[PDB]
Paper text:
Here, we describe identification of two bacterial effectors that reverse PR ubiquitination and are thus named deubiquitinases for PR ubiquitination (DUPs; [name] and [name]). Structural analyses revealed that [name] and SidE ubiquitin ligases harbor a highly homologous catalytic phosphodiesterase (PDE) domain. However, unlike SidE ubiquitin ligases, [name] displays increased affinity to PR-ubiquitinated substrates, which allows [name] to cleave PR ubiquitin from substrates.
In particular, [name]/B-Ub structures displayed a closed conformation with Ub due to extensive electrostatic interactions, while the SidE PDE domain lacked the corresponding residues. Accordingly, [name] displayed a strong binding affinity and high kon to Ub, ADPR-Ub, and PR-ubiquitinated peptides, while the SdeA PDE domain showed weak affinity to Ub and ADPR-Ub. Moreover, the SdeA PDE domain did not bind to the PR-ubiquitinated serine peptide, whereas [name] maintained a strong binding affinity.
Author numbering:
A (entry chain B): 1 to 76
B (entry chain A): 3 to 310
The structure:
Amino acid sequence: MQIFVKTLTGKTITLEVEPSDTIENVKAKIQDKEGIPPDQQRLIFAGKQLEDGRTLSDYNIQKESTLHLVLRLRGG
Amino acid sequence: SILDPEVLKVAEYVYQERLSKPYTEVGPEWEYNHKTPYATRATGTGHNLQRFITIDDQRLHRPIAGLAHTMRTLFYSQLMYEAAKRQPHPHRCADGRTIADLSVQDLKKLNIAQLFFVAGRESEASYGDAYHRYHLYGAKQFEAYARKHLTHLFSEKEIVLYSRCIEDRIGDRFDETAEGYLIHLSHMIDLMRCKSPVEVFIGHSRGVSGIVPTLIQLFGREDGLDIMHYARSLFAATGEAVPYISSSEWPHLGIESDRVERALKIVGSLEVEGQEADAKKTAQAGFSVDGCYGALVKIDTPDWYHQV
Protein backbone atom coordinates (compact mmCIF):
# COMPACT_ATOMS: atom_id res chain seq x y z
CA MET A 1 0.00 0.00 0.00
CA GLN A 2 1.05 3.72 -0.14
CA ILE A 3 1.83 5.63 3.14
CA PHE A 4 2.90 9.32 3.27
CA VAL A 5 6.14 10.44 5.11
CA LYS A 6 6.05 14.26 5.86
CA THR A 7 8.87 16.30 7.57
CA LEU A 8 7.53 18.81 10.22
CA THR A 9 8.48 21.60 7.72
CA GLY A 10 6.24 19.74 5.15
CA LYS A 11 8.56 18.02 2.56
CA THR A 12 6.59 14.76 1.78
CA ILE A 13 7.24 11.40 -0.01
CA THR A 14 5.11 8.20 -0.31
CA LEU A 15 6.42 4.58 0.18
CA GLU A 16 5.12 1.18 -1.13
CA VAL A 17 4.84 -0.98 2.06
CA GLU A 18 2.91 -4.02 3.49
CA PRO A 19 1.14 -3.80 6.93
CA SER A 20 3.49 -6.40 8.64
CA ASP A 21 6.60 -4.33 7.50
CA THR A 22 8.75 -3.38 10.62
CA ILE A 23 9.62 0.40 11.11
CA GLU A 24 13.35 -0.65 10.81
CA ASN A 25 12.31 -1.96 7.33
CA VAL A 26 10.55 1.37 6.46
CA LYS A 27 13.50 3.41 7.88
CA ALA A 28 15.78 1.36 5.53
CA LYS A 29 13.29 2.22 2.69
CA ILE A 30 13.35 6.03 3.56
CA GLN A 31 17.20 5.88 3.34
CA ASP A 32 17.01 4.09 -0.10
CA LYS A 33 14.78 6.92 -1.49
CA GLU A 34 16.16 10.06 0.32
CA GLY A 35 19.67 9.28 1.77
CA ILE A 36 18.57 9.92 5.44
CA PRO A 37 20.30 7.48 7.88
CA PRO A 38 17.87 5.42 10.07
CA ASP A 39 19.05 6.86 13.46
CA GLN A 40 18.58 10.47 12.15
CA GLN A 41 14.82 9.62 11.71
CA ARG A 42 12.38 9.94 14.66
CA LEU A 43 9.00 8.67 13.24
CA ILE A 44 5.51 9.64 14.78
CA PHE A 45 1.84 8.59 13.97
CA ALA A 46 -1.47 9.61 15.71
CA GLY A 47 0.68 11.35 18.40
CA LYS A 48 2.68 8.25 19.47
CA GLN A 49 6.34 7.64 18.36
CA LEU A 50 6.97 4.53 16.14
CA GLU A 51 9.30 1.63 17.23
CA ASP A 52 11.75 -0.43 15.04
CA GLY A 53 10.62 -4.00 16.02
CA ARG A 54 6.87 -3.31 15.66
CA THR A 55 4.78 -3.28 12.43
CA LEU A 56 2.46 -0.76 10.67
CA SER A 57 -0.46 -3.11 11.59
CA ASP A 58 0.54 -2.66 15.37
CA TYR A 59 -0.21 1.14 14.98
CA ASN A 60 -3.40 0.67 12.77
CA ILE A 61 -1.57 2.39 9.79
CA GLN A 62 -3.71 2.05 6.58
CA LYS A 63 -3.49 3.16 2.89
CA GLU A 64 -2.53 6.89 2.31
CA SER A 65 -1.76 7.34 6.11
CA THR A 66 0.51 10.34 6.99
CA LEU A 67 3.47 9.57 9.35
CA HIS A 68 5.52 12.53 10.68
CA LEU A 69 9.37 12.58 10.32
CA VAL A 70 11.48 14.76 12.70
CA LEU A 71 14.70 15.70 10.75
CA ARG A 72 17.13 18.18 12.54
CA LEU A 73 19.43 18.86 9.52
CA ARG A 74 19.63 17.54 5.93
CA GLY A 75 23.23 16.23 5.40
CA GLY A 76 23.96 16.47 9.16
CA SER B 1 14.91 38.77 27.00
CA ILE B 2 17.89 39.71 29.29
CA LEU B 3 19.42 36.97 31.54
CA ASP B 4 21.64 37.72 34.59
CA PRO B 5 25.38 37.10 33.90
CA GLU B 6 25.48 34.66 36.89
CA VAL B 7 22.78 32.59 35.00
CA LEU B 8 24.92 32.44 31.81
CA LYS B 9 28.05 31.54 33.98
CA VAL B 10 26.08 28.48 35.29
CA ALA B 11 25.08 27.64 31.62
CA GLU B 12 28.84 27.92 30.67
CA TYR B 13 29.73 25.21 33.28
CA VAL B 14 26.74 22.94 32.33
CA TYR B 15 27.60 23.19 28.55
CA GLN B 16 31.24 22.20 29.36
CA GLU B 17 30.47 19.30 31.78
CA ARG B 18 27.20 17.86 30.30
CA LEU B 19 25.63 19.33 27.08
CA SER B 20 28.94 19.32 25.08
CA LYS B 21 29.67 15.70 26.16
CA PRO B 22 28.68 12.76 23.90
CA TYR B 23 25.82 10.25 24.52
CA THR B 24 27.35 7.35 26.50
CA GLU B 25 24.23 5.01 26.73
CA VAL B 26 24.39 4.18 22.95
CA GLY B 27 25.52 1.42 20.55
CA PRO B 28 24.77 -2.33 20.31
CA GLU B 29 24.55 -2.89 24.13
CA TRP B 30 21.70 -0.19 24.22
CA GLU B 31 19.73 -1.39 21.11
CA TYR B 32 16.15 -2.59 21.95
CA ASN B 33 13.76 -5.24 20.50
CA HIS B 34 10.36 -5.86 22.25
CA LYS B 35 10.46 -9.52 21.03
CA THR B 36 13.70 -10.02 23.10
CA PRO B 37 13.18 -7.24 25.68
CA TYR B 38 15.99 -8.16 28.21
CA ALA B 39 18.67 -9.27 25.65
CA THR B 40 20.41 -5.85 26.19
CA ARG B 41 21.10 -3.08 28.83
CA ALA B 42 18.16 -1.14 27.20
CA THR B 43 14.55 -1.96 28.33
CA GLY B 44 12.96 0.31 25.62
CA THR B 45 13.51 2.14 22.26
CA GLY B 46 15.39 5.40 21.60
CA HIS B 47 19.02 5.03 22.79
CA ASN B 48 20.62 5.49 19.28
CA LEU B 49 18.16 8.16 17.95
CA GLN B 50 19.81 11.53 16.94
CA ARG B 51 23.04 11.05 19.01
CA PHE B 52 24.89 13.84 17.04
CA ILE B 53 24.93 15.73 13.65
CA THR B 54 27.90 16.95 11.54
CA ILE B 55 28.42 20.71 10.85
CA ASP B 56 31.76 21.48 8.98
CA ASP B 57 33.22 18.09 10.18
CA GLN B 58 32.40 19.05 13.84
CA ARG B 59 30.14 16.93 16.03
CA LEU B 60 27.03 18.65 17.50
CA HIS B 61 26.24 16.11 20.26
CA ARG B 62 22.68 15.52 21.66
CA PRO B 63 21.47 18.19 19.17
CA ILE B 64 17.74 17.93 20.16
CA ALA B 65 18.60 17.88 23.93
CA GLY B 66 21.60 20.32 23.56
CA LEU B 67 22.45 24.01 24.33
CA ALA B 68 19.80 25.69 22.13
CA HIS B 69 16.98 23.54 23.66
CA THR B 70 18.24 24.05 27.26
CA MET B 71 18.67 27.90 26.98
CA ARG B 72 15.38 28.45 24.96
CA THR B 73 13.34 27.30 28.06
CA LEU B 74 14.75 30.19 30.21
CA PHE B 75 13.36 32.80 27.70
CA TYR B 76 9.98 30.92 27.86
CA SER B 77 9.91 30.95 31.74
CA GLN B 78 10.78 34.72 31.53
CA LEU B 79 7.88 35.34 29.08
CA MET B 80 5.27 33.21 31.02
CA TYR B 81 6.19 35.11 34.25
CA GLU B 82 4.59 38.29 32.73
CA ALA B 83 1.85 36.21 30.89
CA ALA B 84 0.81 34.70 34.30
CA LYS B 85 0.63 38.20 35.91
CA ARG B 86 -1.85 39.38 33.22
CA GLN B 87 -4.38 36.68 34.41
CA PRO B 88 -6.96 37.68 37.09
CA HIS B 89 -6.81 34.08 38.55
CA PRO B 90 -3.60 32.38 37.38
CA HIS B 91 -3.52 28.57 38.04
CA ARG B 92 -2.75 28.02 41.81
CA CYS B 93 -0.23 25.18 42.45
CA ALA B 94 -0.30 22.41 45.15
CA ASP B 95 2.00 24.69 47.28
CA GLY B 96 -0.74 27.43 47.14
CA ARG B 97 1.18 29.93 44.91
CA THR B 98 0.87 30.98 41.22
CA ILE B 99 3.78 31.80 38.82
CA ALA B 100 2.73 35.48 39.23
CA ASP B 101 3.50 35.28 43.02
CA LEU B 102 7.12 34.25 42.24
CA SER B 103 9.54 37.20 42.71
CA VAL B 104 12.38 38.20 40.26
CA GLN B 105 14.92 36.37 42.48
CA ASP B 106 13.01 32.99 42.41
CA LEU B 107 12.91 33.23 38.56
CA LYS B 108 16.77 33.63 38.40
CA LYS B 109 16.99 30.52 40.70
CA LEU B 110 14.44 28.75 38.46
CA ASN B 111 16.49 29.68 35.29
CA ILE B 112 19.68 28.08 36.91
CA ALA B 113 17.58 24.88 37.54
CA GLN B 114 16.24 24.77 33.91
CA LEU B 115 19.92 24.41 32.75
CA PHE B 116 20.23 20.90 34.31
CA PHE B 117 16.66 19.76 33.40
CA VAL B 118 17.80 17.42 30.49
CA ALA B 119 21.62 17.86 31.18
CA GLY B 120 21.72 14.35 32.78
CA ARG B 121 20.63 12.58 29.56
CA GLU B 122 22.95 9.81 28.30
CA SER B 123 20.65 9.23 25.18
CA GLU B 124 17.31 10.09 23.39
CA ALA B 125 15.72 7.07 25.24
CA SER B 126 12.31 8.26 26.44
CA TYR B 127 10.68 5.19 28.16
CA GLY B 128 9.98 6.10 31.81
CA ASP B 129 12.97 4.05 33.08
CA ALA B 130 15.47 6.00 30.87
CA TYR B 131 13.61 9.36 31.30
CA HIS B 132 13.52 9.11 35.20
CA ARG B 133 17.14 7.82 35.39
CA TYR B 134 18.41 10.79 33.28
CA HIS B 135 16.31 13.32 35.28
CA LEU B 136 17.83 11.82 38.50
CA TYR B 137 21.38 12.37 37.08
CA GLY B 138 20.62 16.04 36.08
CA ALA B 139 19.19 16.55 39.61
CA LYS B 140 22.44 15.26 41.37
CA GLN B 141 24.62 17.31 38.95
CA PHE B 142 22.58 20.39 40.06
CA GLU B 143 22.80 19.51 43.82
CA ALA B 144 26.66 19.18 43.88
CA TYR B 145 27.32 22.39 41.80
CA ALA B 146 24.60 24.34 43.71
CA ARG B 147 25.88 23.29 47.21
CA LYS B 148 29.52 24.13 46.24
CA HIS B 149 29.30 27.50 44.29
CA LEU B 150 25.69 28.85 44.76
CA THR B 151 25.18 28.87 48.63
CA HIS B 152 25.36 32.72 48.31
CA LEU B 153 22.12 32.39 46.17
CA PHE B 154 20.35 29.09 47.25
CA SER B 155 19.28 27.97 50.78
CA GLU B 156 19.54 24.21 51.58
CA LYS B 157 15.66 24.04 51.52
CA GLU B 158 15.75 25.45 47.88
CA ILE B 159 18.38 22.95 46.58
CA VAL B 160 16.18 20.11 47.99
CA LEU B 161 13.17 21.86 46.31
CA TYR B 162 14.77 22.60 42.85
CA SER B 163 16.44 19.08 42.71
CA ARG B 164 12.96 17.53 43.36
CA CYS B 165 11.55 19.61 40.38
CA ILE B 166 14.40 18.50 37.99
CA GLU B 167 14.05 14.86 39.19
CA ASP B 168 10.21 15.00 38.44
CA ARG B 169 9.55 12.20 40.92
CA ILE B 170 7.14 9.26 40.40
CA GLY B 171 4.20 10.50 42.62
CA ASP B 172 4.86 14.31 42.36
CA ARG B 173 2.14 16.41 40.58
CA PHE B 174 2.85 18.51 37.40
CA ASP B 175 2.55 21.87 39.25
CA GLU B 176 3.29 20.36 42.74
CA THR B 177 5.17 23.75 43.02
CA ALA B 178 4.88 27.11 41.16
CA GLU B 179 8.63 26.88 40.18
CA GLY B 180 8.31 23.23 38.87
CA TYR B 181 4.97 24.10 37.16
CA LEU B 182 6.81 26.92 35.23
CA ILE B 183 9.97 24.71 34.64
CA HIS B 184 7.65 22.02 33.07
CA LEU B 185 5.68 24.66 31.06
CA SER B 186 9.06 26.00 29.76
CA HIS B 187 10.29 22.46 28.88
CA MET B 188 6.85 21.84 27.21
CA ILE B 189 6.77 24.86 24.79
CA ASP B 190 10.13 23.67 23.26
CA LEU B 191 8.59 20.20 22.41
CA MET B 192 7.06 22.02 19.42
CA ARG B 193 10.46 21.41 17.69
CA CYS B 194 10.11 17.56 17.69
CA LYS B 195 6.30 16.72 17.84
CA SER B 196 3.57 16.02 15.16
CA PRO B 197 0.75 18.64 15.00
CA VAL B 198 -1.43 16.04 16.96
CA GLU B 199 0.53 16.23 20.30
CA VAL B 200 1.00 20.03 19.69
CA PHE B 201 -2.67 21.01 18.96
CA ILE B 202 -4.92 17.90 19.51
CA GLY B 203 -3.14 16.31 22.54
CA HIS B 204 -1.75 12.70 22.39
CA SER B 205 -4.86 11.23 24.19
CA ARG B 206 -8.57 12.03 24.89
CA GLY B 207 -7.50 13.30 28.36
CA VAL B 208 -4.41 15.48 27.55
CA SER B 209 -5.32 18.81 25.81
CA GLY B 210 -2.39 19.47 23.43
CA ILE B 211 0.55 21.91 23.90
CA VAL B 212 -1.05 25.02 22.30
CA PRO B 213 -4.53 24.46 23.88
CA THR B 214 -2.48 24.49 27.17
CA LEU B 215 -0.95 27.90 26.29
CA ILE B 216 -4.48 29.17 25.31
CA GLN B 217 -6.29 27.69 28.42
CA LEU B 218 -3.66 29.17 30.82
CA PHE B 219 -2.65 32.52 29.15
CA GLY B 220 -5.71 33.25 26.87
CA ARG B 221 -5.87 32.83 23.02
CA GLU B 222 -4.14 36.17 22.31
CA ASP B 223 -1.27 35.86 24.87
CA GLY B 224 -1.29 32.04 24.25
CA LEU B 225 -0.60 32.27 20.46
CA ASP B 226 1.88 35.18 20.95
CA ILE B 227 3.85 32.72 23.22
CA MET B 228 3.71 30.02 20.47
CA HIS B 229 4.90 32.33 17.58
CA TYR B 230 7.82 33.54 19.81
CA ALA B 231 8.79 29.89 20.55
CA ARG B 232 8.83 29.32 16.69
CA SER B 233 10.86 32.58 16.07
CA LEU B 234 13.44 31.30 18.66
CA PHE B 235 13.46 27.98 16.66
CA ALA B 236 14.34 30.09 13.54
CA ALA B 237 17.03 32.08 15.49
CA THR B 238 18.78 28.82 16.71
CA GLY B 239 18.66 27.16 13.22
CA GLU B 240 15.93 24.61 14.18
CA ALA B 241 13.50 23.40 11.46
CA VAL B 242 10.40 25.57 12.24
CA PRO B 243 7.33 23.32 11.71
CA TYR B 244 4.33 24.46 9.60
CA ILE B 245 0.76 24.56 11.16
CA SER B 246 -2.52 23.59 9.35
CA SER B 247 -6.02 23.35 10.94
CA SER B 248 -7.24 21.96 7.53
CA GLU B 249 -4.92 18.84 7.97
CA TRP B 250 -6.00 18.02 11.63
CA PRO B 251 -9.08 15.95 10.47
CA HIS B 252 -6.81 13.63 8.33
CA LEU B 253 -4.30 12.64 11.14
CA GLY B 254 -6.19 9.50 12.39
CA ILE B 255 -7.97 11.07 15.46
CA GLU B 256 -11.72 11.19 16.41
CA SER B 257 -13.17 14.49 15.04
CA ASP B 258 -14.20 15.36 18.67
CA ARG B 259 -10.54 16.10 19.65
CA VAL B 260 -9.91 17.99 16.32
CA GLU B 261 -13.07 20.18 16.78
CA ARG B 262 -12.19 20.71 20.48
CA ALA B 263 -8.72 21.87 19.26
CA LEU B 264 -10.45 23.88 16.43
CA LYS B 265 -12.88 25.71 18.85
CA ILE B 266 -9.86 26.39 21.19
CA VAL B 267 -6.95 27.09 18.75
CA GLY B 268 -9.39 28.50 16.14
CA SER B 269 -8.15 28.35 12.52
CA LEU B 270 -4.31 28.31 12.18
CA GLU B 271 -2.62 28.20 8.74
CA VAL B 272 1.12 29.29 8.74
CA GLU B 273 4.09 27.93 6.61
CA GLY B 274 7.23 26.18 8.01
CA GLN B 275 10.94 27.21 7.58
CA GLU B 276 13.93 24.93 6.79
CA ALA B 277 16.85 24.17 9.21
CA ASP B 278 20.14 26.15 8.85
CA ALA B 279 23.48 24.38 9.53
CA LYS B 280 25.12 27.83 10.22
CA LYS B 281 22.55 29.15 12.80
CA THR B 282 22.41 25.64 14.50
CA ALA B 283 26.25 25.49 14.88
CA GLN B 284 26.40 29.13 16.18
CA ALA B 285 23.71 28.07 18.76
CA GLY B 286 25.14 24.61 19.56
CA PHE B 287 28.91 25.16 20.16
CA SER B 288 29.00 28.25 22.49
CA VAL B 289 26.79 29.93 25.18
CA ASP B 290 27.82 33.40 23.79
CA GLY B 291 26.55 32.40 20.30
CA CYS B 292 23.42 30.71 21.66
CA TYR B 293 22.59 33.68 24.02
CA GLY B 294 23.43 36.31 21.35
CA ALA B 295 21.35 34.65 18.59
CA LEU B 296 18.26 34.40 20.97
CA VAL B 297 18.26 37.93 22.66
CA LYS B 298 17.98 39.45 19.12
CA ILE B 299 14.36 38.10 18.91
CA ASP B 300 11.43 40.45 19.84
CA THR B 301 9.27 39.33 22.80
CA PRO B 302 5.56 40.28 22.29
CA ASP B 303 4.42 43.92 22.89
CA TRP B 304 2.96 43.33 26.42
CA TYR B 305 6.26 41.75 27.75
CA HIS B 306 8.15 44.36 29.88
CA GLN B 307 10.90 42.74 32.05
CA VAL B 308 11.28 43.94 35.70
